Design a binder for this molecule. Structure first.
Ligand SMILES: O[C@@H]1[C@@H](O)[C@H](O[C@@H]2CO[C@@H](O[C@@H]3CO[C@@H](O)[C@H](O)[C@H]3O)[C@H](O)[C@H]2O)OC[C@H]1O
Length: 328
Protein backbone atom coordinates (compact mmCIF):
# COMPACT_ATOMS: atom_id res chain seq x y z
CA UNK A 1 0.00 0.00 0.00
CA UNK A 2 2.29 2.65 1.35
CA UNK A 3 1.27 5.72 -0.56
CA UNK A 4 4.28 7.80 -1.60
CA UNK A 5 3.03 11.15 -0.45
CA UNK A 6 2.40 9.77 3.08
CA UNK A 7 5.80 8.04 3.27
CA UNK A 8 7.42 11.34 2.24
CA UNK A 9 4.99 13.59 4.20
CA UNK A 10 7.75 14.92 6.50
CA UNK A 11 10.32 15.52 3.70
CA UNK A 12 8.67 17.31 0.77
CA UNK A 13 5.58 17.36 -1.38
CA UNK A 14 5.33 14.58 -3.97
CA UNK A 15 4.02 15.74 -7.33
CA UNK A 16 2.94 14.55 -10.77
CA UNK A 17 2.49 16.29 -14.14
CA UNK A 18 -1.14 15.92 -15.21
CA UNK A 19 -3.87 16.53 -17.79
CA UNK A 20 -7.68 16.38 -17.24
CA UNK A 21 -7.99 12.75 -18.43
CA UNK A 22 -5.58 11.71 -15.62
CA UNK A 23 -8.33 12.15 -13.00
CA UNK A 24 -10.07 9.05 -14.39
CA UNK A 25 -9.55 5.33 -14.05
CA UNK A 26 -6.27 3.89 -12.84
CA UNK A 27 -4.37 7.21 -13.15
CA UNK A 28 -6.94 8.92 -10.93
CA UNK A 29 -6.45 6.26 -8.26
CA UNK A 30 -2.65 6.50 -8.38
CA UNK A 31 -2.85 10.30 -7.96
CA UNK A 32 -5.20 10.30 -4.95
CA UNK A 33 -3.20 7.46 -3.37
CA UNK A 34 0.35 8.70 -3.90
CA UNK A 35 0.43 12.39 -4.79
CA UNK A 36 -0.39 15.65 -3.02
CA UNK A 37 1.01 18.00 -5.70
CA UNK A 38 -0.12 18.46 -9.33
CA UNK A 39 1.50 20.33 -12.25
CA UNK A 40 -0.53 20.98 -15.41
CA UNK A 41 1.68 19.38 -18.08
CA UNK A 42 0.49 21.82 -20.77
CA UNK A 43 -2.76 23.55 -19.83
CA UNK A 44 -1.29 26.52 -17.97
CA UNK A 45 1.25 27.32 -20.70
CA UNK A 46 0.74 30.64 -22.47
CA UNK A 47 -0.32 29.19 -25.88
CA UNK A 48 -2.97 26.96 -24.27
CA UNK A 49 -4.46 29.23 -21.61
CA UNK A 50 -4.14 32.52 -23.56
CA UNK A 51 -4.10 31.71 -27.30
CA UNK A 52 -5.30 35.13 -28.54
CA UNK A 53 -5.12 38.51 -26.76
CA UNK A 54 -8.83 38.66 -26.01
CA UNK A 55 -9.30 34.93 -25.37
CA UNK A 56 -8.41 32.88 -22.31
CA UNK A 57 -9.12 29.19 -22.02
CA UNK A 58 -9.64 28.29 -18.38
CA UNK A 59 -11.66 25.06 -18.71
CA UNK A 60 -8.82 22.58 -18.27
CA UNK A 61 -6.93 24.50 -15.57
CA UNK A 62 -10.21 25.03 -13.63
CA UNK A 63 -10.81 21.28 -13.71
CA UNK A 64 -7.26 20.66 -12.47
CA UNK A 65 -7.72 23.23 -9.66
CA UNK A 66 -11.06 21.70 -8.63
CA UNK A 67 -9.70 18.13 -8.53
CA UNK A 68 -6.76 19.34 -6.42
CA UNK A 69 -9.02 21.20 -3.94
CA UNK A 70 -11.38 18.21 -3.65
CA UNK A 71 -8.44 15.92 -2.80
CA UNK A 72 -6.37 18.22 -0.57
CA UNK A 73 -3.71 18.73 -3.22
CA UNK A 74 -1.96 21.88 -4.43
CA UNK A 75 -0.63 22.99 -7.82
CA UNK A 76 2.63 24.14 -9.31
CA UNK A 77 1.94 27.00 -11.74
CA UNK A 78 3.81 26.00 -14.89
CA UNK A 79 4.75 28.31 -16.57
CA UNK A 80 4.47 32.10 -17.09
CA UNK A 81 7.43 33.04 -19.28
CA UNK A 82 9.02 30.50 -21.64
CA UNK A 83 10.49 30.64 -25.18
CA UNK A 84 8.33 27.65 -26.18
CA UNK A 85 4.53 27.21 -26.46
CA UNK A 86 3.96 30.98 -26.37
CA UNK A 87 1.71 32.43 -29.10
CA UNK A 88 3.06 34.88 -31.68
CA UNK A 89 0.42 37.60 -30.95
CA UNK A 90 2.30 38.63 -27.81
CA UNK A 91 5.21 39.89 -29.92
CA UNK A 92 3.25 41.53 -32.75
CA UNK A 93 1.89 45.08 -33.00
CA UNK A 94 -0.11 44.69 -36.21
CA UNK A 95 2.42 44.49 -39.05
CA UNK A 96 5.37 45.58 -36.87
CA UNK A 97 7.21 43.81 -34.08
CA UNK A 98 5.89 44.82 -30.65
CA UNK A 99 8.10 47.22 -28.62
CA UNK A 100 9.41 46.58 -25.10
CA UNK A 101 6.64 48.35 -23.13
CA UNK A 102 3.76 46.77 -25.10
CA UNK A 103 5.14 43.28 -24.47
CA UNK A 104 5.62 44.13 -20.80
CA UNK A 105 2.04 45.43 -20.58
CA UNK A 106 0.67 42.23 -22.18
CA UNK A 107 2.80 40.18 -19.78
CA UNK A 108 1.43 42.23 -16.86
CA UNK A 109 -2.12 41.49 -17.89
CA UNK A 110 -1.44 37.77 -18.51
CA UNK A 111 0.22 37.28 -15.16
CA UNK A 112 -2.45 39.32 -13.34
CA UNK A 113 -5.20 37.21 -14.93
CA UNK A 114 -3.66 33.74 -14.43
CA UNK A 115 -2.11 34.32 -11.00
CA UNK A 116 -5.30 35.93 -9.66
CA UNK A 117 -7.44 32.94 -10.76
CA UNK A 118 -5.17 30.22 -9.33
CA UNK A 119 -3.24 31.91 -6.44
CA UNK A 120 -5.40 30.15 -3.85
CA UNK A 121 -4.34 26.63 -4.98
CA UNK A 122 -0.80 27.23 -6.35
CA UNK A 123 2.05 26.81 -3.85
CA UNK A 124 4.88 27.40 -6.34
CA UNK A 125 5.09 29.20 -9.70
CA UNK A 126 7.52 28.61 -12.53
CA UNK A 127 7.71 32.33 -13.32
CA UNK A 128 10.53 31.98 -15.86
CA UNK A 129 11.43 28.68 -17.57
CA UNK A 130 14.65 27.75 -19.38
CA UNK A 131 16.02 31.32 -19.77
CA UNK A 132 19.68 30.28 -19.33
CA UNK A 133 21.48 29.58 -22.62
CA UNK A 134 22.06 25.81 -22.79
CA UNK A 135 24.49 25.57 -25.74
CA UNK A 136 26.87 28.57 -26.07
CA UNK A 137 28.71 30.42 -23.22
CA UNK A 138 26.49 33.51 -23.43
CA UNK A 139 24.44 33.67 -20.19
CA UNK A 140 20.89 34.13 -21.45
CA UNK A 141 19.02 32.24 -24.12
CA UNK A 142 18.05 34.64 -26.91
CA UNK A 143 14.23 34.30 -27.02
CA UNK A 144 11.68 36.92 -28.21
CA UNK A 145 11.07 37.65 -24.51
CA UNK A 146 14.76 38.28 -23.90
CA UNK A 147 15.34 40.25 -27.14
CA UNK A 148 12.32 42.54 -26.89
CA UNK A 149 12.05 43.18 -23.14
CA UNK A 150 15.86 43.16 -22.77
CA UNK A 151 18.43 42.05 -20.18
CA UNK A 152 16.17 42.71 -17.17
CA UNK A 153 13.22 40.63 -18.33
CA UNK A 154 13.69 37.96 -15.65
CA UNK A 155 13.53 40.45 -12.75
CA UNK A 156 10.58 42.18 -14.48
CA UNK A 157 8.60 38.92 -14.72
CA UNK A 158 9.30 38.08 -11.08
CA UNK A 159 8.28 41.54 -9.81
CA UNK A 160 5.01 41.33 -11.72
CA UNK A 161 4.23 37.83 -10.42
CA UNK A 162 4.99 38.87 -6.85
CA UNK A 163 2.01 41.29 -6.98
CA UNK A 164 -0.56 38.53 -7.56
CA UNK A 165 0.83 35.31 -6.07
CA UNK A 166 0.37 35.88 -2.31
CA UNK A 167 2.34 33.31 -0.36
CA UNK A 168 2.97 31.18 -3.45
CA UNK A 169 6.70 30.66 -3.91
CA UNK A 170 8.34 32.01 -7.08
CA UNK A 171 10.76 29.74 -8.91
CA UNK A 172 13.21 29.94 -11.75
CA UNK A 173 12.92 26.59 -13.57
CA UNK A 174 15.39 24.88 -15.96
CA UNK A 175 16.89 21.60 -17.24
CA UNK A 176 20.49 20.31 -17.22
CA UNK A 177 21.06 22.76 -14.35
CA UNK A 178 22.78 20.07 -12.29
CA UNK A 179 25.46 19.74 -15.02
CA UNK A 180 28.75 21.60 -14.25
CA UNK A 181 28.80 24.05 -17.21
CA UNK A 182 25.15 25.04 -16.70
CA UNK A 183 25.37 24.96 -12.88
CA UNK A 184 28.12 27.63 -12.86
CA UNK A 185 26.17 29.75 -15.37
CA UNK A 186 22.80 29.41 -13.57
CA UNK A 187 24.43 30.20 -10.19
CA UNK A 188 25.78 33.44 -11.68
CA UNK A 189 22.44 34.49 -13.14
CA UNK A 190 20.52 33.71 -9.91
CA UNK A 191 23.08 35.36 -7.61
CA UNK A 192 22.79 38.56 -9.63
CA UNK A 193 18.96 38.48 -9.66
CA UNK A 194 18.96 38.27 -5.87
CA UNK A 195 21.49 41.10 -5.44
CA UNK A 196 19.11 43.18 -7.57
CA UNK A 197 16.19 42.50 -5.17
CA UNK A 198 14.39 39.98 -7.40
CA UNK A 199 11.71 38.22 -5.31
CA UNK A 200 12.85 34.72 -6.37
CA UNK A 201 12.29 32.04 -3.69
CA UNK A 202 13.90 29.05 -5.37
CA UNK A 203 15.28 27.04 -8.29
CA UNK A 204 13.53 24.28 -10.15
CA UNK A 205 15.84 21.47 -11.24
CA UNK A 206 13.79 19.81 -14.00
CA UNK A 207 15.68 16.52 -13.68
CA UNK A 208 15.12 15.18 -17.19
CA UNK A 209 17.61 12.44 -16.60
CA UNK A 210 18.71 9.08 -17.94
CA UNK A 211 20.20 5.81 -16.63
CA UNK A 212 23.63 6.19 -18.29
CA UNK A 213 24.84 9.41 -16.66
CA UNK A 214 27.71 8.20 -14.45
CA UNK A 215 28.11 11.82 -13.27
CA UNK A 216 24.51 12.42 -12.10
CA UNK A 217 24.87 11.76 -8.36
CA UNK A 218 27.98 13.94 -7.99
CA UNK A 219 26.30 16.54 -10.24
CA UNK A 220 23.04 16.52 -8.24
CA UNK A 221 24.70 16.75 -4.80
CA UNK A 222 26.84 19.64 -6.03
CA UNK A 223 23.90 21.50 -7.59
CA UNK A 224 21.60 21.14 -4.57
CA UNK A 225 24.39 22.50 -2.33
CA UNK A 226 25.41 25.28 -4.75
CA UNK A 227 21.82 26.56 -5.09
CA UNK A 228 21.24 26.18 -1.31
CA UNK A 229 24.19 28.52 -0.65
CA UNK A 230 22.23 31.34 -2.32
CA UNK A 231 19.46 30.77 0.25
CA UNK A 232 17.09 29.31 -2.34
CA UNK A 233 14.43 26.62 -1.95
CA UNK A 234 14.96 23.64 -4.25
CA UNK A 235 12.27 21.83 -6.14
CA UNK A 236 12.72 18.85 -8.40
CA UNK A 237 10.07 19.82 -10.88
CA UNK A 238 9.90 17.40 -13.83
CA UNK A 239 11.63 14.17 -12.74
CA UNK A 240 11.94 11.38 -15.26
CA UNK A 241 14.67 8.84 -15.98
CA UNK A 242 14.90 7.79 -19.60
CA UNK A 243 16.32 4.40 -20.56
CA UNK A 244 18.03 6.07 -23.56
CA UNK A 245 21.02 8.38 -23.76
CA UNK A 246 19.68 11.64 -25.22
CA UNK A 247 21.31 11.10 -28.63
CA UNK A 248 20.41 7.38 -28.84
CA UNK A 249 17.48 7.66 -31.26
CA UNK A 250 16.90 3.90 -31.62
CA UNK A 251 13.26 3.03 -32.31
CA UNK A 252 13.58 -0.79 -32.03
CA UNK A 253 12.87 -1.44 -28.32
CA UNK A 254 9.44 -2.86 -27.49
CA UNK A 255 10.42 -3.07 -23.81
CA UNK A 256 13.18 -2.04 -21.44
CA UNK A 257 16.06 -4.52 -21.13
CA UNK A 258 16.93 -6.12 -17.79
CA UNK A 259 20.10 -4.01 -17.42
CA UNK A 260 17.97 -0.90 -18.12
CA UNK A 261 15.18 -1.73 -15.66
CA UNK A 262 17.72 -2.53 -12.93
CA UNK A 263 20.00 0.47 -13.63
CA UNK A 264 16.93 2.71 -13.45
CA UNK A 265 16.04 1.36 -10.01
CA UNK A 266 19.60 2.06 -8.77
CA UNK A 267 19.49 5.63 -10.18
CA UNK A 268 16.04 6.33 -8.65
CA UNK A 269 17.44 4.96 -5.36
CA UNK A 270 20.55 7.09 -5.70
CA UNK A 271 18.66 10.33 -6.54
CA UNK A 272 15.92 9.91 -3.89
CA UNK A 273 18.52 9.12 -1.20
CA UNK A 274 20.09 12.42 -2.23
CA UNK A 275 16.60 14.06 -2.12
CA UNK A 276 16.08 12.60 1.38
CA UNK A 277 19.54 13.79 2.45
CA UNK A 278 18.63 17.36 1.47
CA UNK A 279 15.14 17.33 3.01
CA UNK A 280 15.81 20.67 4.74
CA UNK A 281 16.24 22.53 1.42
CA UNK A 282 14.05 20.49 -0.95
CA UNK A 283 10.39 21.41 -0.64
CA UNK A 284 8.84 19.44 -3.51
CA UNK A 285 9.62 16.57 -5.87
CA UNK A 286 7.40 16.21 -8.95
CA UNK A 287 7.60 13.49 -11.59
CA UNK A 288 6.78 14.43 -15.17
CA UNK A 289 3.96 11.95 -15.48
CA UNK A 290 2.23 9.28 -13.43
CA UNK A 291 2.96 5.98 -15.24
CA UNK A 292 4.85 4.83 -18.38
CA UNK A 293 1.43 4.79 -20.10
CA UNK A 294 1.61 8.55 -20.81
CA UNK A 295 4.96 10.25 -21.08
CA UNK A 296 6.27 13.06 -23.25
CA UNK A 297 9.39 10.91 -23.59
CA UNK A 298 7.47 8.79 -26.16
CA UNK A 299 7.70 11.73 -28.57
CA UNK A 300 10.82 13.58 -27.39
CA UNK A 301 13.48 13.57 -28.65
CA UNK A 302 12.12 11.03 -31.14
CA UNK A 303 8.58 11.20 -32.49
CA UNK A 304 6.71 7.92 -32.03
CA UNK A 305 8.91 5.55 -30.05
CA UNK A 306 8.49 4.34 -26.47
CA UNK A 307 10.37 5.19 -23.27
CA UNK A 308 9.83 3.89 -19.68
CA UNK A 309 10.91 6.84 -17.54
CA UNK A 310 8.65 6.90 -14.47
CA UNK A 311 7.88 5.11 -11.14
CA UNK A 312 4.80 3.18 -12.33
CA UNK A 313 4.75 0.88 -15.40
CA UNK A 314 2.42 0.78 -18.46
CA UNK A 315 -0.15 -1.23 -16.45
CA UNK A 316 -0.02 1.18 -13.49
CA UNK A 317 1.89 -1.09 -11.12
CA UNK A 318 4.67 0.27 -8.90
CA UNK A 319 8.06 -0.63 -10.40
CA UNK A 320 10.91 -2.11 -8.34
CA UNK A 321 12.21 1.47 -8.46
CA UNK A 322 9.10 2.57 -6.51
CA UNK A 323 9.72 0.11 -3.67
CA UNK A 324 13.38 1.16 -3.50
CA UNK A 325 12.65 4.88 -2.89
CA UNK A 326 10.12 3.99 -0.14
CA UNK A 327 12.47 1.72 1.73
CA UNK A 328 13.74 4.02 4.33
O1 LIG B 1 3.40 19.23 -30.54
C1 LIG B 1 3.37 19.80 -29.25
C2 LIG B 1 4.15 18.91 -28.31
O2 LIG B 1 5.51 18.89 -28.67
C3 LIG B 1 3.97 19.41 -26.88
O3 LIG B 1 4.63 18.53 -26.01
C4 LIG B 1 4.85 19.05 -24.72
C5 LIG B 1 6.17 19.79 -24.69
O4 LIG B 1 6.39 20.25 -23.38
C6 LIG B 1 6.60 19.21 -22.46
O5 LIG B 1 7.02 19.70 -21.21
C7 LIG B 1 8.19 20.49 -21.23
C8 LIG B 1 9.45 19.62 -21.15
O6 LIG B 1 10.59 20.45 -21.15
C9 LIG B 1 10.71 21.29 -20.02
O7 LIG B 1 11.89 22.07 -20.11
C10 LIG B 1 9.49 22.19 -19.90
O8 LIG B 1 9.54 22.88 -18.65
C11 LIG B 1 8.18 21.41 -20.02
O9 LIG B 1 7.06 22.29 -20.06
C12 LIG B 1 5.32 18.38 -22.34
O10 LIG B 1 5.57 17.29 -21.49
C13 LIG B 1 4.84 17.91 -23.70
O11 LIG B 1 3.53 17.37 -23.59
O12 LIG B 1 2.61 19.41 -26.55
C14 LIG B 1 1.85 20.32 -27.33
C15 LIG B 1 1.92 19.91 -28.80
O13 LIG B 1 1.24 20.88 -29.59
Amino acid sequence: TVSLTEKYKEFFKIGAAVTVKDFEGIHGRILTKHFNSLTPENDMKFERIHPKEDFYNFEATDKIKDFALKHNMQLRGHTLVWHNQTPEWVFRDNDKEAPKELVIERLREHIKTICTRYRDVVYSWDVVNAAVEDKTDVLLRDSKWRRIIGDDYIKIAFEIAKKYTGNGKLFYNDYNNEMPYKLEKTYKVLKSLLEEGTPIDGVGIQAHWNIWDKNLIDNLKRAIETYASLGLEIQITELDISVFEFEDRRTDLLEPTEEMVELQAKVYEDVFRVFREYRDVITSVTLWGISDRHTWKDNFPVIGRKDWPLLFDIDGKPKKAFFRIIDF
